[PDB]
Chain A
Amino acid sequence: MKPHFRNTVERMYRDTFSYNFYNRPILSRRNTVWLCYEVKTKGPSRPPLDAKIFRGQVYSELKYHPEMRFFHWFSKWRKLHRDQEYEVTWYISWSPCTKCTRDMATFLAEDPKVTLTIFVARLYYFWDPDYQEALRSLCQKRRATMKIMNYDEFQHCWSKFVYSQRELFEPWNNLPKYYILLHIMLGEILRHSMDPPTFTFNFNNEPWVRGRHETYLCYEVERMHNDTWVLLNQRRGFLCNQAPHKHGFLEGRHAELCFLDVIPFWKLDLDQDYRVTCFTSWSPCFSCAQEMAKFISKNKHVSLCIFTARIYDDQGRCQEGLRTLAEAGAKISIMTYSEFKHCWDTFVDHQGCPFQPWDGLDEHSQDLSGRLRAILQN
């Protein structure tokens, strides 16, 4: 009375769904991998023609992994209609493995009429160089669209791929923090970059602007060695503020807060000296500045440096926060032509276009520098 490993189901129990899809970035004992999939013609907004669930142990043989088993079934099912193009959607608890990623790349390169979207609750072995390279080859190269699961996708899975009866989805405690951490880490891995228009809009030193309701932050890190700075090519990326949302954060988090939330994951050695360079469209507000000051005081090793395109002054408390930032040791500056060009060439998919400065860039930079310089000492 010990049935064989059941590697396929139609829906999963509520306790199972809650125990497996809990998306803490560093979670143990989730040894099984679940994969709820849907297939549908390219014609949108019609009931899917097939949708099921494949499960499998992580430490099994590669052929029993849910991804490989799904592709094995799909290869046979695809001969039915060779003239029809398909879109496939995955919701998988653990992210695929290196071998699975490479083999999915091969499988999809073989098929020119199948689009694949993947949603992951957590990233599996996100700190292994080969897994990073395998994901880079699979996804960005150009179609496999790997994303993280949000409240919407979790609710969709709960509604369609769970036996829940007359039950409403109940998010666990830290769902939004974990989601944003995973989003930041995946963006760091895949090496996402801004579109040219977005940076052009959001990084104008021009004091007079319109619609500047969102704050960006483009970061990078440098390590000490031989009295020299070495770029840590892992620690590079950017992020933007999250607007308040009923299901997400009720009060939208500030890009600076997300940056401070992600910094601890890097496991920067306590005995090593690191410089964290940041570029921002708006100067940090008072609450953000206080958080940075206390964090930098707490962290001896880290050394923060902030460059800005504009000074966000409101009620005069921001300048007060800058004083405690400076006391902590955080050097604050303004973005000039050199730094603007560096951001354009480093954090934008410019397609090799050279930076095109706008009118009055130097004058605006000088005005901002004059405004900023006096506050610290005077």
Chain B
Amino acid sequence: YGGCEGPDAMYVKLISSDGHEFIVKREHALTSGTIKAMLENETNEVNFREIPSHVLSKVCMYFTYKVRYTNSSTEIPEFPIAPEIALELLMAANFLDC
């Protein structure tokens, strides 16, 4: 049981550029290189300058997907993606190195 205020946060705070805040476990963000490097151990909050709220929601869902199925290699399920969101999702992934 980790408290976000403490060093061993166990739930890093993400602030969407749009204005929405999510929170996700430390390892889930560790799967993303930029946040991994940023989190430095004395900080527990990351703010995004350009990523929309929906983009950050989808990348968090992707973190969940990857951590759930990083080791699994059997009958992987589908991960929704749409053309209208695809370009900005690619940009966000490049920024976060997903």
- Direct chain A–B contact by Cβ atoms under 8 Å: no
Binding site for B on A (CB under 8 A): none
